[PDB]
């Protein structure tokens, strides 16, 4: 499992948990656990969550420790649909919902991530994969970028 | 005999044990959903987490609640306040 | 004064119910941002490297 996960994914799990570990005690109660999983893109039924807590709840506290959270989410992240993540990402770039990623969109994303990039460098990012020549990236073109491997 | 901390601890134990905690909490979240309060507050919270998420918190909530308090419809606020007072009238003696 | 005590408790209780609503919504929205930041960062960097 350690080898299967990218360094990016391991950090994603750690940060999701840390963000909602309010006591800083290495444990999450039900509520904290629900949103921590949502932070990793997993929305599970209440019943399903209780099962997860109960399956690892040695103490009877109704809490989940980080080490179990890490294993559990790790398995789920490996089962992520690669294409669904990509499409979800596309929507996040296309916040104006025009159906295409404008330079404005890409610049807005670049600012949120604190990326130091010239407009020309951003314009280039679009030009390199703009197949229609409409100066913007539609969904299928966006997928093409992310599927290249 | 009973100090304020004891009284309020007792009021809350009874609020939850009586089941009125869920009834009021449910009535409220239903009224707030009806008037699109959640979504405005989501945008507000999301808008306020921006411009800069400074991820140690929660200084910001103190600013969001006031407008959010005012942003509640008088119909919802009065309705819920009436339920709460009704519960208290039944539980406080003398 | 029983009525003064009840009115105050009514007001404090109302504040609590509402603060809780805000607390949960705040927690909910916060999960959405982290998830969104994670996706955008991943696929932006993937893009910038393609």
């Amino acid at each position: 499992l350690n080898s299967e996960l990218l360094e990016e994914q391991k950090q994603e799990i750690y940060e999701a948990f840390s963000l909602f570990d309010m006591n800083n005690d290495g444990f999450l109660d039900y509520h904290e656990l629900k949103v921590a999983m949502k932070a990793l893109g997993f929305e599970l039924p209440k019943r399903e969550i209780l099962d997860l807590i109960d399956e690892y709840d040695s103490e009877g506290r109704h809490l989940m420790k980080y080490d179990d959270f890490y294993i559990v989410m790790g398995e789920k992240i490996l089962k992520r649909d690669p294409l669904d993540e990509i499409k979800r990402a596309f929507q996040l770039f296309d916040d104006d919902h025009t159906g295409k990623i404008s330079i404005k969109n890409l610049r807005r994303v670049a600012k949120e991530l604190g990326e130091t990039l010239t407009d020309e460098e951003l314009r280039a990012m679009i030009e390199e994969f703009d197949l229609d020549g409409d100066g913007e990236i539609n969904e299928n073109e966006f997928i093409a970028i992310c599927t290249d491997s | 005999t009973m100090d304020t901390a004891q009284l309020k601890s007792q009021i809350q134990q009874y609020l939850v044990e009586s089941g009125n905690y869920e009834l009021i909490s449910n009535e409220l979240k239903a009224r707030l959903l009806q008037e699109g309060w959640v979504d405005k507050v989501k945008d507000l919270t999301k808008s306020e987490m921006n411009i800069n998420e400074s991820t140690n918190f929660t200084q910001i909530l103190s600013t969001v609640e006031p407008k959010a308090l005012e942003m509640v419809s008088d119909s919802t606020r009065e309705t819920v306040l009436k339920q709460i007072r009704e519960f208290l009238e039944e539980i406080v003696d003398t | 004064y029983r009525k003064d005590f009840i009115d105050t408790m009514t007001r404090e209780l109302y504040d609590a119910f509402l603060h809780e609503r805000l607390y949960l919504i705040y927690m909910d929205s916060r999960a959405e941002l982290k998830r969104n930041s994670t996706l955008k960062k991943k696929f932006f960097e993937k893009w910038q490297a393609s």
Partner: peptide, 9 residues
Amino acid sequence: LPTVGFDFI
């Protein structure tokens, strides 16, 4: 049963 968000006390 009441969440931490419930600041009554």
